[PDB]
Amino acid sequence: EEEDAGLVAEAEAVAAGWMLDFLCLSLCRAFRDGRSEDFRRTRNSAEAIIHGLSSLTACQLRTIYICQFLTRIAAGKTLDAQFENDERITPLESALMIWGSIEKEHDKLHEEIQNLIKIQAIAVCMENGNFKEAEEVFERIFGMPFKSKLLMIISQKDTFHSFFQHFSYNHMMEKIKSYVNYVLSEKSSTFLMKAAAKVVESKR
């Protein structure tokens, strides 16, 4: 009776792990495709499954970090969203913290995404007329030539500066989608998706 209960709990943990990988893959695909409503609904399912998991492997923590990173990027222009206990941290600042914590290679693409999130974290404040908040985000992030241009734009209150058009929100999204394509290729072979794909193929 107690051994049965324990074996059932172990099986529920195995199934939750399979469900987390599948939901991460669905979330990545919705982000890549721009399917806003599917992303919202999948994020809700991923959060609920995560609250039912206790012990995590290094791989499951990385998968969770990727889900959290994409959620903050999707909410990057929503300055009323509070993702951290410190209410001053903006969504792109929260995405930057996660980006620097994921156990992943620090290749050229990693650094390009990092710097585009930093510029846009300031740009989104400027675009909403939040000039003092842009200065505070700048101080938290920066924590020389790149830093100096940003402080100049902030002090001029140059909301639609040409610098923000060369390192735009769309360019940040496109670089992030390139990274998402690599996660989709790596997780396409996860148990639930493979089994579901085999079922669909066998009926064709």
Ligand X SMILES: CCc1ccc(OCC(=O)N2CCCCC2)cc1
Query: Does 79 participate in binding Ca ion (rule CB under 5 A)?
Result: yes
Residues 13-42 that bind a second copy (CB under 8 A): 14-15, 18-19, 22, 26, 29, 33, 38, 41-42
- Picked from ligand X, Ca ion, a second copy, none, the partner binding residue 59 (CB below 5 to 8 A depending on kind) is none
CA distances from 4 to 7, 13, 15, 65, 96 (A): 5, 14, 17, 33, 44
Cβ–Cβ < 8 Å for 138, 150:
yes
Q: Indicate the residue among 40 and 149 with the shorter CB distance to a second copy.
A: 40
Tell me the C-alpha distance between 72 and 96, whole Å: 9
**Six-digit token pair at 110?**
């990693």
- Picked from Ca ion, ligand X, a second copy, none, the partner binding residue 79 (CB below 5 to 8 A depending on kind) is Ca ion
Backbone angles phi, psi at 7, to 5 degrees: -70, -35
For residue 18, how many C-alpha atoms fall within 13 Å in the half-sphere facing its CB? 12
Summarize as ranges the residues that interact with Ca ion (CB under 5 A). Answer: 79
Summarize as ranges the residues that interact with a second copy (CB under 8 A). Answer: 5, 7-8, 10-12, 14-15, 18-19, 22, 26, 29, 33, 38, 41-42, 44-45, 47-49, 51-52, 191-193, 195-197, 199-201
